[PDB]
Structure 1
Amino acid sequence: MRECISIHVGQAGVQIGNACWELYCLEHGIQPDGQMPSDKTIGGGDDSFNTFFSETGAGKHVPRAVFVDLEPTVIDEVRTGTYRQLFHPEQLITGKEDAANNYARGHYTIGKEIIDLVLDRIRKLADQCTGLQGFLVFHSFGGGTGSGFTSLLMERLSVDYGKKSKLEFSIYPAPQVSTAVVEPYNSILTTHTTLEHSDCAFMVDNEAIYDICRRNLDIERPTYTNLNRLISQIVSSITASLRFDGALNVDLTEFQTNLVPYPRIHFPLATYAPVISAEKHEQLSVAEITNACFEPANQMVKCDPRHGKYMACCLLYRGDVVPKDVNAAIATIKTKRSIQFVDWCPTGFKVGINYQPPTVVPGGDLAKVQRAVCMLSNTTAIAEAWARLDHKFDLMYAKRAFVHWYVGEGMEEGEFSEAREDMAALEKDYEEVGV
């Protein structure tokens, strides 16, 4: 067994982290107390769920997680939440002055003052790992801490844990819920500085999550709680292979080798189905949920893979699913949809089935479904998200709007341009992979 340490950064990262560990606890039968009546090996053990949970001599299952935020309002809700006794105080790190939606303030000014501490707190979790695999980092693109401090942390984790993988779960900025006007700046800045330090990043567009909540769950104006519960399900689908027994995506290295042939193009598109309102329903079949994986409306990033090319595709089922029905579904979809792979890759699917149907938190808005699927496909169509973002960046930077806020924090105007040209180089790499 090999351990995984989760790092939650900023409001988005921390609040999403809460929704994930709450879900993890329900799936592994871990009560808010931290006890786990199913775990018969007290004080230790090397089961699959130990990849995310350590054990105390008193039978408490505590996460291999660290929550950091440059202001305490959000992490204080963890210290008093229903899962407060789950976490150990040294796992929750807070400042008192946040980055004010300023990448430079998060990376340079305030990040410098706290980077040393969080690494020691991470070193504490690492020291109690027999063989740490790597890190899962949850953060936003638009926040000053999520963008600015993560890139600094990702740089230091590479120099301190060189042989260890890092996966991202990144929240892509959407104006329907965005906090700031400068989120395009912070997004480009943190992508540039983190690109070489991230082995594979799962990008989630709040716009897509927002509209899925409006359409499928029929919430008039979704809140972060709505968005994070849906996001938590998707995260749980991606990480289920590390926490449960299986043979597909069993370690963080396997995510890279299965979904990322080219290192820079390490942003798989995620598609989830089905999402049904708890206030409702006919149960969908293997073919119907697999077909839904190719509807733009169910993707974490709105884009059209029909006009891109696939480098890798992975199907992760949860519930009542047998391999026979998966093949019969793939055979039907491949003849009735536009699934074109790159010439230098096989046209196929890596399938993983977990018999335990998806768990939904009581009192939530998700109807318990008997079988679900999350598809991870590395398609060049996701570059549409970079195109939208780079365009917004170009509009403001042409007039140097808001640039003074970043230069006032010790950052140089050159980092803006050098980060933009890196995205121009990321944008061209996609172009010549799905020609």
Structure 2
Amino acid sequence: MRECISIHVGQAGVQIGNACWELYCLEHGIQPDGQMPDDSFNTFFSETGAGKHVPRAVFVDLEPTVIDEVRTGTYRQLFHPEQLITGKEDAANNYARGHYTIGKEIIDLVLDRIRKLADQCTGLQGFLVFHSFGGGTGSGFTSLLMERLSVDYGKKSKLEFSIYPAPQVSTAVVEPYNSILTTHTTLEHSDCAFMVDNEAIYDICRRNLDIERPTYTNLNRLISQIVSSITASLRFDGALNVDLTEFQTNLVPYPRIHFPLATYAPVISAEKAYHEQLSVAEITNACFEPANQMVKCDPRHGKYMACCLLYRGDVVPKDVNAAIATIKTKRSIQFVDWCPTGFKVGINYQPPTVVPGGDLAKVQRAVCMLSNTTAIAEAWARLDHKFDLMYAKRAFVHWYVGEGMEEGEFSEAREDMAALEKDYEEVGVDS
């Protein structure tokens, strides 16, 4: 009952998926071989007659080298070989190759493997899709997959975890093109999308974890903690739970306005030894500090539309209610005039788990806030500007047109982004 199928697309999707499933195994006491010496964890893990716990997940990439590491790694026994799907050559950082040229060759196979997982569900909640905005596969193949999932599963909820590009850790010059093209194509097929700005995570690792030059492993371990907080409400039976349907109804007022800002606290270096444990009020207040956000933007000069607080660890409702009561009296946190009771709270008793050999310190209690703010439209503005700089000269466009795309798709996608930025302006206006 109430199953969730995770789909990891391209390098970023796959590598983040590795970090998430490794963490889930530690949280639930599942060994790398699938043996588990609550039952809520069955939403993410199926069980075989041999007692093996297998992830309800599919890993897909157009090149084999990333997924080949999963196939030969520590957790190779965890996944059925048919859950790990690879092609021969990648999308060469081109949205058009992930969507058409290369993607078309593997799409049917992927949908068949997803159908097999869906058949094992007695009450499928929906899908969780992990991908980058910048990759040719992460952008192109994900768009193609989302469109096909809407045909095969109608209106079934589809949630994304999208990696927003950063110059500090970029892989291609055309990432802004792939980001706008995938955003345009996926917009009507996604119900809720959690964006993760790689620059925000990079900054958090440098400032809060004292890592001079963060690696993808450092970034992914932090991301996995946030993804775990979002999914903990589905994998554990706590005091107050939030199902996928409760996330969407509480966070998304308008279909297009579906990009919540995630904030997590506390992020403490393992090497720090005198810090006494932070209270519910202290960690809750940290959720309104820009230094703890997953996307770089300024909510103080924006309006809130929704606020969801996901606590984990030693947390009691009395302390949460007191912390929320003081947030309500803060003039510096402005809600839109059309939203009378903007809060949804969830509490999971299981404390935050930390990976052995990791960078994060173990804490008694943590919280992840998912807020719907007009300030997130700053992330779109920055991406659209990069797109405009290149597109004004038609730089690199020939690579996409060479793969059968029409130049008109670029302006159609960009017009949709301009309309989206306009939508965020309009929702903030008083009635």
Whether TM-score is above 0.5 comes out as yes
- Contact 2:91–2:137 at 8 Å: present in 1 too? yes
- TM-superposed CA distance for 1:248, in Å, is 5.2
- TM-superposed CA distance for 1:339, in Å, is 1.3
In structure 2, C-alpha distance between the alignment counterparts of 1:8 and 1:249, rounded to whole Å: 25
- TM-superposed CA distance for 1:256, in Å, is 1.0
Q: Does 1:361 align with 2:367?
A: no
* Residue in structure 1 matching 2:63, options 49, 53, 71: 71
- Contact 1:170–1:202 at 8 Å: present in 2 too? yes
Unaligned runs of 5+ in 2: none
Deviations 1:313-352 (A, max 9, x none): 0001111111121222223333345111112212442111
Unaligned runs of 5+ in 1: 38-45
- TM-superposed CA distance for 1:240, in Å, is 0.7
Deviations 1:101-146 (A, max 9, x none): 1101110111111111100111111111112111100000000000
- Contact 1:357–1:370 at 8 Å: present in 2 too? yes
- TM-superposed CA distance for 1:249, in Å, is 5.5
- Contact 1:341–1:347 at 8 Å: present in 2 too? no
Corresponding residue SS for 2:381: helix
Match of 1:14 in 2: 14
In structure 1, C-alpha distance between the alignment counterparts of 2:336 and 2:362, rounded to whole Å: 37
Deviations 1:50-102 (A, max 9, x none): 11000000000000000000001100110111111000000000012100111
- Contact 2:46–2:56 at 8 Å: present in 1 too? yes
Deviations 1:262-303 (A, max 9, x none): 110100000000001111132111111101000011000011
Q: Does 1:132 align with 2:118?
A: no
- Number of matched pairs: 427
Cα distance 1:246–1:282, how it changes in 2: closer, same or farther (>3 A)? Answer: closer
Corresponding residue SS for 1:54: strand
Q: TM-score, normalised to structure 1's length?
A: 0.96
In structure 2, C-alpha distance between the alignment counterparts of 1:274 and 1:201, rounded to whole Å: 23
In structure 2, C-alpha distance between the alignment counterparts of 1:387 and 1:118, rounded to whole Å: 34
- TM-superposed CA distance for 1:48, in Å, is 1.4
In structure 1, C-alpha distance between the alignment counterparts of 2:338 and 2:105, rounded to whole Å: 46
Deviations 1:37-57 (A, max 9, x none): 1xxxxxxxx931111000000
Instruction: Report percent identity of matched pairs.
Output: 100
In structure 2, C-alpha distance between the alignment counterparts of 1:103 and 1:419, rounded to whole Å: 13
- Contact 1:36–1:61 at 8 Å: present in 2 too? yes
* Residue in structure 2 matching 1:339, options 333, 355, 359: 333
- TM-superposed CA distance for 1:356, in Å, is 1.0
Corresponding residue SS for 2:379: helix
In structure 2, C-alpha distance between the alignment counterparts of 1:383 and 1:130, rounded to whole Å: 38
Cα distance 1:381–1:420, how it changes in 2: closer, same or farther (>3 A)? Answer: same
Match of 1:41 in 2: none
Cα distance 1:317–1:205, how it changes in 2: closer, same or farther (>3 A)? Answer: same
Corresponding residue SS for 1:336: coil
Match of 2:51 in 1: 59
In structure 2, C-alpha distance between the alignment counterparts of 1:70 and 1:247, rounded to whole Å: 42
Alpha-carbon RMSD across the aligned residues, in angstroms, is 1.2
Cα distance 1:192–1:115, how it changes in 2: closer, same or farther (>3 A)? Answer: same
- TM-superposed CA distance for 1:246, in Å, is 4.1
- Contact 2:241–2:348 at 8 Å: present in 1 too? no
* Residue in structure 1 matching 2:148, options 140, 152, 156: 156
